[PDB]
Amino acid sequence: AGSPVGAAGWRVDPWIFWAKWGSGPDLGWHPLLCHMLDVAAVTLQMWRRVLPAAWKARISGVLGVGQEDAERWLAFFAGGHDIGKASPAFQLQLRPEQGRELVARRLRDAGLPLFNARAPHGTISANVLETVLADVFGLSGRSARWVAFAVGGHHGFVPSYDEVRRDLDQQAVGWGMWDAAREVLLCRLADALGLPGSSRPTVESTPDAFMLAGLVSVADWIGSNEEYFPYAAQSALQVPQLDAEAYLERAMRQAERAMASLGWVGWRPASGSMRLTELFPYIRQPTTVQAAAEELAGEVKSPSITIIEAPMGEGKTEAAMLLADTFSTAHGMSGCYFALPTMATSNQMFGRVTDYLRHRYPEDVVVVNLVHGHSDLSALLQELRQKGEEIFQLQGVYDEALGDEQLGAVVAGQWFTRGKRALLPPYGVGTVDQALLAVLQVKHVFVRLFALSTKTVIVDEVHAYDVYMTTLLHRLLEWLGALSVPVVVLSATLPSARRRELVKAYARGAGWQAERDLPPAGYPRITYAAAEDVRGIHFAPSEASRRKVALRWVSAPEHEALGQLLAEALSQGGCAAIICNTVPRAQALYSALREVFPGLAEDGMPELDLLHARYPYEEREVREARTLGRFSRNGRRPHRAILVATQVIEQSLDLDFDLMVTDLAPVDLVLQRMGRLHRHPVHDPLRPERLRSPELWVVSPQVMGDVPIFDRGSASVYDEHTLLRSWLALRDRDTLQLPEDIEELVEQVYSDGRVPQGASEELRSLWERTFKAQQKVLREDSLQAKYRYIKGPGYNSIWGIVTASVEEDAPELHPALQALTRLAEPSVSAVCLVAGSGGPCLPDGTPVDLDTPPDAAMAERLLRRSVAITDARVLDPLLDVPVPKGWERSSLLRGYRPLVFDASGRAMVGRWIVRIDPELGIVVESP
């Protein structure tokens, strides 16, 4: 520091600097030191009221200090996140319309030099902390640099090394008097936290600092809510006179109230030492997999991965929740995230999770988990309808890459509105995609790693096709292993190579130097892996799982006779499902099937029904509720019904069907679809005699010679070569011998064996060609990994864990990078409206003002019309439609495109016609 500073300069007065500033009705402002005390207070309350004890113990172990020192120091860093706001570049950012000259004269009175240079405040925070944390606070240079970059990454991305130590203007950061000012602020915040003269923490572990950045981001978000953290200054004209400690106390109580509103407090484990029959009253005699799980439960270690492989319908989820209960009770990991399969809704799972949660936690589960632990939109809607202003609302989030403070407040505020919100609460149910996003190079990934770090992860239903086609779960397992996160993976069946690479990934993250191989065990089995311990527990399949399943084919010439086949099969009655690989095929087959089954069912709704994601959300709620009401284990089963549907039935849902028709798919997916066939024994006596023998109809592809010709939709959804392997594995079967044939088929298709089996040359050509295509895809993804995936845990530099496109912002996320990695289909969110005078209107029938943000009621009614279009034909033209100016400033409606149908229910989008059918849902069609 090259500028001498006199005592008059050291008088400074800390309170003059601002961190938050008002706009309209709020003429006041928030002093920077107040904001730092607020974020530190939120960190303290997190440590004392939210975080699981195992997390605090482990982080205290990494820090090398006791839990008290770890608490005050983490609070010090998190409060130190905005230290760079004390720079000329940020203080002069103020709007001229809102008293910028007043702040200018106020700084000038202190004697601070002024400069017009501009830099993001977080990079400045890294630039100052990397030196100040060492030269004053006595931390090692590595810990200082690590805390500096991590804390400086809080608005989206950790700064690149050049951003902090090369391109950064000195005039932007300031020096001399500014350094004395920041030194004063940091010393006062530290004294308020009681840092002297406690032993200095070691922060040299890269992954830990990385997730800690996510903790800091969440803390700043909590401090950004003006309802719980009102600005201390009542007007720009005057600087408040404050005692830092009393303000810290008030900030702590406010933090407690704010986090209490989010339902993070207070999940007391309330042990306890419960058995499986107690947690789940509905089960009398536990299934064999649950028995082996109950036996394993007494021997589990704090960080370990479990892989459960049992036939579908055997009740693996209760075993997973059992191990999770053992983790929360006996190992201090009181939190869990239930990672659902991508096509699954959270609804049915959430009730099971709630029913388990009643046995371990007080009735706060009613007042907390019901609205906060749910990922899907219905909970957000009920939270909107409920009094009062239940949704968390941010303001004054100064993300430089967005155009203004409130815009950044909206983008950050999406974390409390979008499905990713389910990640935040200690118990949450949601898609596996939210957890898989943690390894992508996207905004705020460290927030995801931080959320996952505090909970055991339970991956419900893993498919072999997914683990074969992508590395996402492997990388997530590496980072999960680094964070000492317990993991349970449910699966109907996996190839041995897949289990090997998964356990290898979690072990690689764990740092487990032991290289001993996984013990062999017959199917069904439970793999297990702790530090010093590794197990392969085989167990006898339940006798109910021993069934022969008929496998009939319907060839393309017979395909139009398929409805007549449904007539001859269901003539005696009985439920039946028909899975389709794509929405348009489902709509078409349904339209064809309407002629065959006109009749109403006993429940007063038609026996024929359709289900897919492409509906306005309320209609989706109706059809989903009707389906779950018909075909669940306890539902009012119709004497006869037919349900055409996509793969939304294929995953997670607890449905039962007397008969199953399905499109060709990779075999693990077909079996997963087949798990809904005769799933519940209680339904056995009442089944029609024609359907008493389980039977699985598969839709055959057109076959020129011996060469299959897959339909374009399935070809676009699934890898073509895998479909070829599956069709070859299934084409000669007459009967499936469960449960061994499950593992047999899956280990046949995904394993090394090439079986042309002496067929035609053209088929060999199709084989080699489709395989070359698949390998070209996998290779191309492997070569683009630097631009897509974050560095693994063993990477040494805290910077460069995420490189480009840093601070865009905010880069996709779901529409873009999600698609290149095939994590999910790219899509547009849309709001179905109707045309009329005065612009777009709701169907019933009130006008919408697109120019202003919606009120919560109107936002709810608008969200009820929402739909996630994913069709390639109209996706781009829909993106070209601007998001209306009032919506992008709303966290509830950012990224949503209005979709104005006419009275005919038609709308002109691109060359294509979009139409909103009462039965078919949204329908794309050529004009």
Ligand X SMILES: Nc1ncnc2c1ncn2[C@H]1C[C@H](O)[C@@H](COP(=O)(O)OP(=O)(O)OP(=O)(O)O)O1
DSSP string, 262-283: TT-TT---------HHHH-TT-
Residue 287 marked as a ligand binder: yes
Residue 159 or 313: the one with the smaller Cβ distance to ligand X is: 313
Q: For the CB of residue 654, give the shortest distance to ligand X in the complex, in Å.
A: 4
Residue 272 marked as a ligand binder: no
Q: Considering CB distances under 5 to 8 angstroms, the limit depending on partner class, which of Mg ion, ligand X, Ni ion, none binds residue 709?
A: none
* Closest listed residue to residue 613, CA positions, set 641, 577, 586: 586
Strands 707-709 and 702-704: antiparallel
Residue 287 or 334: the one with the smaller Cβ distance to ligand X is: 287
Q: Considering CB distances under 5 to 8 angstroms, the limit depending on partner class, which of Ni ion, ligand X, Mg ion, none binds residue 231?
A: none
318 lines the binding site for ligand X (CB under 6 A): yes
Q: How far is CA 452 from the centre of its chain?
A: 10
Using alpha carbons, list the distances in angstroms from residue 477 to 430, 486, 642, 917: 18, 10, 40, 43
Question: How far apart are the C-alpha atoms of 415 and 490, rounded to whole Å?
Answer: 28
Total chain residues near ligand X (CB under 6 A): 16
Which of 185, 255, 265, 312 contacts ligand X by CB under 6 A?
Answer: 312
Q: Which residues contact 882 (CB under 8 A, 6 or more apart)?
A: none
Q: What is the per-residue burial (b if ≥16 Cβ within 10 Å, else e) of 866-899? A: bbbbebebbbeebeeeebbeebbbbbbbbebbbb
Q: For the CB of residue 154, give the shortest distance to Ni ion in the complex, in Å.
A: 6
Q: Which residues contact 513 (CB under 8 A, 6 or more apart)?
A: none
Contacting range for ligand X; rule: CB under 6 A; set: 8-16, 266-274, 312-320, 394-402: 312-320
Residue 195 dihedral angles phi and psi, to the nearest 5°? -55, -50
Which of 316, 420, 474, 623 contacts ligand X by CB under 6 A?
Answer: 316
Quick check: 195 and 73 in contact, CB under 8 A?
A: yes
Q: For the CB of residue 582, give the shortest distance to Ni ion in the complex, in Å.
A: 44
Instruction: Lay out the site mask for ligand X across 227-266 (x = CB under 6 A, - = otherwise).
Output: ----------------------------------------
Q: For the CB of residue 294, give the shortest distance to Mg ion in the complex, in Å.
A: 18
- Helix ranges (H only) for 787-926 are 817-820, 856-863, 872-880, 885-888
Cα distance between the two ends of the chain: 71
Contacting range for Mg ion; rule: CB under 5 A; set: 86-94, 102-110, 482-490, 611-619: 482-490
Residue 484 or 491: the one with the smaller Cβ distance to Mg ion is: 491
Q: Considering CB distances under 5 to 8 angstroms, the limit depending on partner class, which of Mg ion, Ni ion, ligand X, none binds residue 478?
A: none
Which of 120, 174, 315, 373 contacts ligand X by CB under 6 A?
Answer: 315
H or E stretch at 707: strand 707-709
398 lines the binding site for Ni ion (CB under 5 A): yes
Which of 461, 658, 668, 807 contacts Mg ion by CB under 5 A?
Answer: 461
Q: Considering CB distances under 5 to 8 angstroms, the limit depending on partner class, which of ligand X, Mg ion, Ni ion, none binds residue 675?
A: ligand X
Residue 772 marked as a ligand binder: no
Which of 14, 31, 52, 313 contacts ligand X by CB under 6 A?
Answer: 313
Q: Look-up: residue for tokens 């820090």?
A: 63
Which of 71, 309, 399, 461 contacts ligand X by CB under 6 A?
Answer: 461
Residue 508 marked as a ligand binder: no
Which of 71, 163, 208, 220 contacts Ni ion by CB under 5 A?
Answer: 220
Which of 168, 215, 394, 492 contacts ligand X by CB under 6 A?
Answer: 492
Q: For the CB of residue 781, give the shortest distance to Mg ion in the complex, in Å.
A: 28
What are 913's strand-pairing partners? 908, 925
Residue 153 or 313: the one with the smaller Cβ distance to Ni ion is: 153
Q: For the CB of residue 891, give the shortest distance to Ni ion in the complex, in Å.
A: 16
Q: For the CB of residue 537, give the shortest distance to ligand X in the complex, in Å.
A: 16
Question: How far apart are the C-alpha atoms of 444 and 447, rounded to whole Å?
Answer: 5
Question: How far apart are the C-alpha atoms of 87 and 173, rounded to whole Å?
Answer: 5
Whether the link from the prior residue into 705 is cis, omega within 30° of 0, is no
Contacting range for ligand X; rule: CB under 6 A; set: 177-185, 279-287, 519-527, 831-839: 279-287
Strands 828-834 and 866-869: antiparallel
Using alpha carbons, list the distances in angstroms from residue 523 to 270, 726, 752: 36, 21, 19
Residues 648-667 that bind ligand X (CB under 6 A): 654
Which of 100, 250, 559, 633 contacts ligand X by CB under 6 A?
Answer: 633
Strands 912-917 and 695-699: unpaired
Residues 285-304 that bind ligand X (CB under 6 A): 286-287, 290
Residue 735 marked as a ligand binder: no
Residue 110 neighbours by CB distance under 10 Å? 17
Q: Which residues contact 179 (CB under 8 A, 6 or more apart)?
A: 1, 3, 5, 128
Residues 55-114 that bind Ni ion (CB under 5 A): 82
Residue 672 marked as a ligand binder: yes
Question: How far apart are the C-alpha atoms of 630 and 645, rounded to whole Å?
Answer: 14
Residue 676 marked as a ligand binder: yes
Question: How far apart are the C-alpha atoms of 155 and 143, rounded to whole Å?
Answer: 21
Residue 313 marked as a ligand binder: yes
Residue 123 marked as a ligand binder: no
H or E stretch at 507: helix 496-510
Which of 163, 220, 309, 314 contacts ligand X by CB under 6 A?
Answer: 314
Instruction: Lay out the site mask for ligand X across 576-615 (x = CB under 6 A, - = otherwise).
Output: ----------------------------------------
Binding residues for dATP: 287, 290, 313, 315-317, 352, 654, 672, 676, 679
Q: Name the residues that contact Mg ion, by CB under 5 A.
A: 460-461, 490
- Chain residues in the site for Ni ion (CB under 5 A): 82, 220, 398
Residues at the site binding ligand X, with contacts judged by CB under 6 A:
283, 286-287, 290, 312-318, 461, 492, 633, 654, 675
**Known binding-site residue numbers:** 287, 290, 313, 315-317, 352, 654, 672, 676, 679
